Design a protein around this ligand. Structure first.
Ligand SMILES: *[C@@H]1O[C@H](CO)[C@@H](O[C@@H]2O[C@H](CO)[C@@H](O[C@H]3O[C@H](CO)[C@@H](O)[C@H](O)[C@@H]3O)[C@H](O)[C@H]2NC(C)=O)[C@H](O)[C@H]1NC(C)=O
Ligand SMILES: *[C@@H]1O[C@H](CO)[C@@H](O[C@@H]2O[C@H](CO)[C@@H](O)[C@H](O)[C@H]2NC(C)=O)[C@H](O)[C@H]1NC(C)=O
Ligand SMILES: *[C@@H]1O[C@H](CO)[C@@H](O[C@@H]2O[C@H](CO)[C@@H](O)[C@H](O)[C@H]2NC(C)=O)[C@H](O)[C@H]1NC(C)=O
Ligand SMILES: *[C@@H]1O[C@H](CO)[C@@H](O[C@@H]2O[C@H](CO)[C@@H](O)[C@H](O)[C@H]2NC(C)=O)[C@H](O)[C@H]1NC(C)=O
Ligand SMILES: CC(=O)N[C@@H]1[C@@H](O)[C@H](O)[C@@H](CO)O[C@H]1O
Ligand SMILES: *[C@@H]1O[C@H](CO)[C@@H](O)[C@H](O)[C@H]1NC(C)=O
Ligand SMILES: *[C@@H]1O[C@H](CO)[C@@H](O)[C@H](O)[C@H]1NC(C)=O
Ligand SMILES: *[C@@H]1O[C@H](CO)[C@@H](O)[C@H](O)[C@H]1NC(C)=O
Ligand SMILES: *[C@@H]1O[C@H](CO)[C@@H](O)[C@H](O)[C@H]1NC(C)=O
Ligand SMILES: *[C@@H]1O[C@H](CO)[C@@H](O)[C@H](O)[C@H]1NC(C)=O
Lengths: 99, 437, 375
């Protein structure tokens, strides 16, 4: 299998090959998000590509429907890296389609 | 030969005998020729009483004009006064209360005039404030109060006619108002992302909206509220659930007593009559009566109506637009300070806005100020190639687009009270460009 | 209990028929003891006495709603104004049955006015549909400089902007003037031939006379007007082949009375199901506060839906005017108005009657020339 670091590397390669250099990182408190964010930041910093990582949204709050809407509206990129559980992914994608 | 001017009072603590011995032989040596005031007060403001008293008053003394005062609460009184003025061709002036709120369309034969301002002028002043503090981002919140479409039209006209390309965010509407479900409107209020909000609603709707915003966390720093006179209500008694820092724009009447306003209105009528006497040898004809049917308008009435549109009293411009409201008044931007009192903040001269605070105080809780960490105070000095200081354009009062505003201090002149006009200037140059970058 | 309904009518025959209508209405809304009472007042010669009579007679009976039809005066008299103001001080809903003035659609001035007849300014919508049926894109709007002319112009311009289009020329004349020759000469040089008119009867007659004198009624032109312009003496001077509009049951006050009575009865019965219901005031003397349930009653009245009625289904738009009202399109063929189609709701259906245009032959004239000479 592949660790989360290798999946992040493949995702960054995907973003690079299609010239999506502007992106936002949206994660929950789901386990492993600390290592995911750390690896993403380390790869971005030690890179000559010129990544534009903005709006690191650690949603954290369990869909209180009060802060999450503004948190998602704070994103103005075109590529969003989402790290959360499948049910949390369903909730967040439904909220995004609402927004 | 004395111009019979009748002063009618509303129900704002009905008393006129205490204020009766101050106009019979007064305000005639000031400037007018000869006046004769007839004072009658109504303790109830229902349409039957208004019609009965005004018709009985017009049935005697050969009245020339009528001066009306209301409380603030009622709004149909303006329409009733318009109806009476159209039916009897007697000039009626509205002084204060809800009757002074401007009716944009009026009956063609009506001579009803209001010492008030349309929504367009208030929006002009509010957008001037926004430009002064560079609040280019704002959101419009309205209720289903009648005239919301007019408010939105005025906002659109002001934004298009300006030169700043304002960013108008999503427009919100309050549906239920007093019977708010606190669920749908709450969801909409929590879906906002604007630092400046312009609200249209009545007094009760204003209280409901502000209480719901306090529930939704739209109060305190980082959020500014601008409202017209409709939500203001009584200025002397600001109610609870009114956020500190609420901004409104009212004419120069909010700190004027009733006697001053009444004498001002009688002075306007007398000045119009004096101008008519100057041009036409005879005095303007008095109103006939409520009965009969004065179908058309005689040229005598029309000349009188056109001769009191342009009246200047004590240096104050009381010109009336064809829609029967003040066209070029001196406005005042008032705000609610930490002591829960409506405090004078800015003036609106001929075409210029004079503010008092260079930085808007963002009180967080009760009285406690904030610092706005992302805000800097910069001290400069005039050096010809680096910092050039000039004066703003007198016609507009603003700075040249390539410059930035800048004030100056002074020795002595204790400025804690902030009752000191700016020596406002504009700065440009190498250092200013570096600072902008 | 007893719920009072007020009415301001013209003749006692309509008072008796209003009594009959309310009596019939209260017999078809359940066997429970809910009663509808009727109070009726004739019109008064002058408006101030009319308002005083409204306050003394109607409001003193705690009327939930007031119906004001029209007086015997010809037309355009603004007679429901005192009733509207007096019953809007207390937010008592007022149902108008005959007046089509465009002022009463302003809810900032008239706070509690609903009506079962659409305003004249809505006629522009029909014109818009005609501009789609016969494919006319260049039009000349010619309106009086009043509230009505400006309202009709505003609605037509809104509809055209929805289509990404504009009127070729908007002309205004002061009401009652007799010197419209300059404006018609100005419109003569224009490329568009379809002329849309909106003015009173006398103004319509004046502009018709000027157009006939200026040879503006010949072949190739199209004259689109409303109901007012083809009524009265303006019919005598109208150029043959002029397309006009009429309202079905527009002057039938009996059907409107019955339909309004049914609407009011249903709205009252729906209102009684709610809580916090307050009795309307006897606001002759001693009362200044508004009726608390008045706004809610008006909301219920406006939101109400119907499918039965003598004049048809009634639906009130957000301004309180009747929507989905049929129109009859009439043509002046040989000095006689001949119907040539019906405006059903949002569409135009033509019958098998040939349309005769203000010139000769029945061929459809395109409403514009080329204007080969250029300035
Ligand atoms: C205004 O419109 C009214 C209704 O739309 C209309 O009244 C209608 O008049 C006819 C008779 O002339 C009635 O017809 C009824 O009579 C027959 C027997 O003759 C019976 O089988 C039925 O009862 C039949 O319906 C209509 O019922 C009647 N409608 C009502 C309810 O009034 C007036 O004549 C119109 N006024 C005008 C045109 O000025
Ligand atoms: C206020 O305005 C009125 C008219 O708007 C002025 O009255 C005009 O005066 C001139 C010359 O005195 C006459 O030729 C006009 O016929 C007058 N107009 C009318 C309608 O009568 C009046 O002089 C103005 N007053 C001031 C102080 O400016
Ligand atoms: C039914 O309607 C009649 C209309 O005349 C009512 O009579 C009026 O009643 C009101 C009070 O509701 C009084 O102010 C008027 O003086 C009465 N006028 C006349 C001519 O009687 C009658 O009381 C109503 N009955 C009800 C409510 O069932
Ligand atoms: C009033 O109407 C008359 C109708 O004859 C106008 O008379 C002529 O109008 C035409 C424009 O179509 C002008 O070219 C002529 O010069 C007019 N002749 C005259 C003045 O007798 C007249 O112009 C109209 N007056 C207005 C509109 O002010
Ligand atoms: C709108 C609603 O909830 N119902 C009202 C309620 O406010 C009121 O307190 C009570 C008094 O009868 O019942 C009714
Ligand atoms: C109200 O009207 C006049 C004073 O305006 C007075 O005669 C009358 O007694 C007053 N009544 C009340 C109840 O105030
Ligand atoms: C200059 O202004 C300061 C402000 O506090 C004052 O203390 C000082 O005395 C002034 N200088 C002179 C010369 O007046
Ligand atoms: C009207 O003018 C004359 C007849 O009066 C005629 O020759 C001409 O064709 C007609 N058309 C116009 C509008 O000139
Ligand atoms: C108008 O007539 C048409 C055609 O029958 C019909 O569909 C519609 O219900 C009518 N609308 C009314 C009564 O306004
Ligand atoms: C008649 O009116 C209805 C609603 O206004 C509309 O949907 C229908 O298409 C119309 N009928 C015709 C013939 O277009």
């Amino acid at each position: 299998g592949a660790s989360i670091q290798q999946q992040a590397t493949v995702m960054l390669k995907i973003m690079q090959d299609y010239d999506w250099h502007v992106f936002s990182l949206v994660t929950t408190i789901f386990p492993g998000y600390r290592d995911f964010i750390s690896f993403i930041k380390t790869t971005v910093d030690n890179s000559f590509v010129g990544w534009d990582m903005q709006n690191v949204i650690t949603l954290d709050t369990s869909f209180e429907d009060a802060k999450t809407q503004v948190q998602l509206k704070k994103i103005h990129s075109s590529v969003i890296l989402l790290y959360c559980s499948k049910d949390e992914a369903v909730l967040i994608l439904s909220e995004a389609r609402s927004l | 030969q004395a111009v019979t001017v009748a002063v009618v009072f509303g129900s704002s603590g009905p008393l006129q005998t205490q204020a009766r011995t101050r106009l019979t032989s007064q305000n005639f040596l000031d400037l007018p020729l000869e006046i004769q005031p007839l004072t009658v007060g109504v303790n109830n403001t229902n349409p039957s009483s208004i019609l009965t008293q005004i018709c009985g008053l017009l049935g005697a003394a050969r009245v020339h004009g009528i001066v009306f005062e209301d409380n603030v609460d009622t709004e149909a009184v303006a329409q009733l006064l318009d109806f009476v003025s159209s039916q009897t061709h007697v000039p009626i002036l509205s002084i204060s209360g809800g009757s002074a709120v401007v009716l944009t369309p009026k009956e063609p034969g009506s001579a009803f005039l209001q010492l008030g301002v349309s929504l367009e002028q208030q929006l002009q002043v509010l957008f001037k404030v926004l430009e002064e503090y560079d609040w280019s981002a704002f959101a419009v919140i309205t209720s289903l109060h009648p005239g919301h479409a007019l408010f939105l039209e005025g906002v659109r006209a002001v934004a298009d006619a300006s030169y700043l390309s304002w960013r108008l965010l999503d427009v919100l509407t309050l549906e239920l108002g007093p019977g708010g479900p606190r669920a749908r409107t709450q969801r909409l209020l929590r879906q906002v992302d604007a630092p400046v909000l312009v609200a249209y609603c009545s007094r009760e709707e204003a209280e409901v909206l502000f209480a719901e915003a306090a529930q939704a966390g739209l109060v305190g720093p980082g959020h500014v509220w601008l409202v017209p006179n409709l939500a203001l209500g009584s200025t002397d008694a600001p109610p609870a659930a009114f956020p500190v820092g609420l901004i409104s724009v009212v004419t120069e009447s909010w700190r004027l007593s009733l006697r001053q306003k009444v004498r001002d209105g009688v002075a306007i009528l007398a000045l119009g009559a004096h101008s008519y006497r100057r041009q036409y040898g005879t005095l303007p004809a008095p109103a006939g009566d409520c009965r009969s049917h004065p179908g058309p308008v005689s040229p005598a009435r029309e000349a009188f109506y056109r001769h009191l549109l342009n009246v200047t009293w004590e240096g104050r411009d009381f010109s009336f637009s064809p829609g029967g409201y003040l066209v070029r008044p001196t406005m005042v931007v008032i705000a609610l300070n930490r002591h829960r009192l409506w405090e004078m903040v800015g003036r609106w001269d001929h075409g210029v806005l004079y503010m008092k605070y260079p930085v808007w105080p963002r009180y967080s809780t009760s009285l406690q100020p904030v610092v706005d960490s992302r805000h800097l105070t910069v001290a400069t000095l005039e050096e010809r190639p680096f910092v050039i200081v000039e004066s703003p354009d007198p016609g507009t009062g603003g700075c040249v687009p390539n410059t930035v505003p800048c004030r100056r201090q002074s020795n002595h002149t204790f400025s804690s009270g902030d009752l000191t006009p700016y020596t406002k200037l504009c700065c440009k140059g190498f250092c200013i460009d570096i600072l902008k970058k | 209990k007893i719920v009072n309904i007020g009415a301001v009518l013209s003749t006692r025959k309509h008072e008796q028929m209003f009594r009959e209508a309310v009596n019939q209405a209260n017999k078809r809304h359940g066997s429970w003891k809910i009663q509808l009472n009727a109070t009726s007042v004739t019109h008064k010669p002058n408006a101030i006495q009319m308002a005083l009579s409204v306050c003394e007679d109607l409001i003193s009976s705690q009327v939930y709603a007031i119906l004001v039809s029209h007086p015997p005066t010809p037309n355009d008299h603004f007679t429901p104004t005192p009733v509207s103001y007096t019953a809007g001080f207390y937010r008592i809903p007022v149902l108008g049955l005959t007046t089509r003035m465009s002022i009463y659609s302003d809810k900032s001035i008239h706070l509690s006015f609903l009506r079962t007849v659409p305003p004249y300014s809505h006629q522009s919508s029909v014109w818009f549909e005609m501009m789609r049926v016969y494919n006319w894109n260049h039009i000349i709007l010619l309106v009086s400089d009043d509230h009505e002319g400006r309202a009709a112009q505003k609605r037509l311009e809104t509809l055209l902007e929805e289509r990404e289009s504009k009127a070729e020329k908007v002309l205004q004349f002061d009401p009652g003037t007799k010197n419209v020759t300059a404006l018609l000469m100005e419109a003569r040089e224009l490329e568009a031939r379809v002329i849309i008119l909106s003015a009173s009867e006398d103004d319509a007659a004046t502009v018709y006379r000027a157009a006939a004198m200026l040879n503006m009624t010949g072949s190739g032109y199209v004259w689109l007007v409303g109901e007012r312009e083809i009524s009265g003496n303006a019919l005598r001077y109208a150029p043959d082949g002029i397309i006009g509009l009429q309202l079905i049951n527009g002057k039938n006050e009996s059907a409107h009375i019955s339909d309004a009575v049914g609407v009011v009865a249903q709205a009252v019965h729906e209102l009684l199901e709610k809580e916090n219901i307050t009795d309307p005031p006897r606001g002759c003397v001693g009362n200044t506060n508004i009726w608390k349930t008045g706004p809610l009653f008006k909301r219920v009245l406006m939101s109400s839906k119907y499918a039965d009625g003598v004049t048809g289904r009634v639906e009130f738009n957000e301004d309180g005017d009747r929507k989905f009202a049929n129109y009859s399109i009439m043509n002046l063929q040989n000095r006689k108005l001949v119907q040539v189609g019906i405006y059903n709701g949002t569409h135009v259906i033509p019958n098998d009657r040939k349309i005769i245009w203000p010139g000769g032959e029945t061929e459809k004239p395109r409403g514009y020339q080329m204007s080969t000479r250029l300035k």
